[PDB]
Design an enzyme around this catalytic site. Sequence first.
Site, PDB file in Angstrom:
ATOM      1  N   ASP A   7     -19.462  19.228  13.502  1.00 15.22           N
ATOM      2  CA  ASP A   7     -18.033  19.334  13.241  1.00 15.22           C
ATOM      3  C   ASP A   7     -17.751  18.969  11.774  1.00 15.22           C
ATOM      4  O   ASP A   7     -17.898  17.815  11.389  1.00 15.22           O
ATOM      5  CB  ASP A   7     -17.345  18.352  14.184  1.00 15.22           C
ATOM      6  CG  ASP A   7     -15.873  18.613  14.342  1.00 15.22           C
ATOM      7  OD1 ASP A   7     -15.205  18.837  13.332  1.00 15.22           O
ATOM      8  OD2 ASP A   7     -15.381  18.576  15.484  1.00 15.22           O
ATOM      9  N   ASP A 105     -15.375  26.211  12.441  1.00 14.77           N
ATOM     10  CA  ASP A 105     -15.456  24.817  12.091  1.00 14.77           C
ATOM     11  C   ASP A 105     -16.545  24.062  12.836  1.00 14.77           C
ATOM     12  O   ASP A 105     -16.992  23.008  12.394  1.00 14.77           O
ATOM     13  CB  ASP A 105     -14.107  24.145  12.316  1.00 14.77           C
ATOM     14  CG  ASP A 105     -14.139  22.704  11.943  1.00 14.77           C
ATOM     15  OD1 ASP A 105     -14.029  22.397  10.737  1.00 14.77           O
ATOM     16  OD2 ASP A 105     -14.340  21.887  12.846  1.00 14.77           O
ATOM     17  N   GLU A 106     -17.002  24.581  13.962  1.00 13.95           N
ATOM     18  CA  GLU A 106     -17.896  23.736  14.730  1.00 13.95           C
ATOM     19  C   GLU A 106     -18.813  24.495  15.670  1.00 13.95           C
ATOM     20  O   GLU A 106     -18.526  25.650  16.060  1.00 13.95           O
ATOM     21  CB  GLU A 106     -17.088  22.688  15.497  1.00 13.95           C
ATOM     22  CG  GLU A 106     -16.318  23.251  16.666  1.00 13.95           C
ATOM     23  CD  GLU A 106     -15.114  22.421  17.029  1.00 13.95           C
ATOM     24  OE1 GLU A 106     -15.189  21.186  17.058  1.00 13.95           O
ATOM     25  OE2 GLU A 106     -14.065  23.008  17.282  1.00 13.95           O
TER      26      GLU A 106
END
Length: 343
Positions: A7, A105-106
């Site tokens: 993350d 993002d992750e």
Amino acid sequence: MIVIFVDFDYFFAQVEEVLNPQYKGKPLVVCVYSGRTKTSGAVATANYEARKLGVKAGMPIIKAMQIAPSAIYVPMRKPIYEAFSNRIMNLLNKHADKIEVASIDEAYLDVTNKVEGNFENGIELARKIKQEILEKEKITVTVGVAPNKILAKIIADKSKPNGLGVIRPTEVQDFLNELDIDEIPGIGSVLARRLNELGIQKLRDILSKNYNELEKITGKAKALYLLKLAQDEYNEPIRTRVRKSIGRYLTLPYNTRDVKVILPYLKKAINEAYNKVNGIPMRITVIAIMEDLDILSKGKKFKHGISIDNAYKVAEDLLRELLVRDKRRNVRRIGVKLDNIII
DNA sequence: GGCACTGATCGGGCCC
DNA sequence: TACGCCCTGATCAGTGCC
Ligand SMILES: [Ca+2]
Ligand SMILES: [Ca+2]
């Protein structure tokens, strides 16, 4: 199973710092400007310096400028952050048996075989991963290590920024015995406050709450989820994720009900939607945000695929109908979504 | 009743 | 006060049909 969740700390802002290191150590705010006014727009993200001053993601720009007038306010450059993401995910892919890119993002990495069941070597591998991303991309991230997706996520978000959360299999039951509902991923605030208030403060308060009265409040899906979750019987495998829709949204120059005015923007939105879609959509949806930021949508799914020239006509009709069922309010923002895509 | 399908709402940075 | 762009699946509502 041994899962490593990754993350990227204050992502957009942090990329802006990598590209312009003069920005580091000072409040920096990444904004989405709509082009109505000089300040019209919204905070996409902010570094921690700016967050100390009260700048929060989602907030109007002008409002952040009230509490942090001396912060640096930069426009969002999504393509670059996309590229950064791509490279980092590529780095991650080389470490995992399987990777699930949950978004720009992750991502989750199943490393079970890689670390040969050894959870400790899983933690060490997580350190190597943080280290590598830092070395190559100059980006700091937060990592969760846990025996499943959800736990990895929860311990990650509880460790930001630049953190390394760990939930060994030894500790899992203890972690579940003292876990709030609002700390669960996929549980709203409209939903959290109900459970929290109406009896169920923590997760374990679900093991002993007549399943049905829970199903009333959450639904079958969420109740089942929370149940197996609390029962330590959630196991969901790491799965490559496939995009299901693409949308493009525009702020109109000025508020209006006139389709003749909105149309060239709607067309523009259709164009780069189609330009970026990877397949042919069976459904086109028109999204209109009204003066008061209320959201109207009217879509149409066909038995076949929708060509762009056809999408112009369909979308115009859908827009005209949205403004037959509202009759009163002006549109502020126009958008289009392509769904049910044939690859 | 219940199947098969279309269609609208929703929350938050993703999740079920 | 203020106000972007973008994305899931679940859930419920309606219709037609056997
Ligand atoms: Ca995140
Ligand atoms: Ca992040």
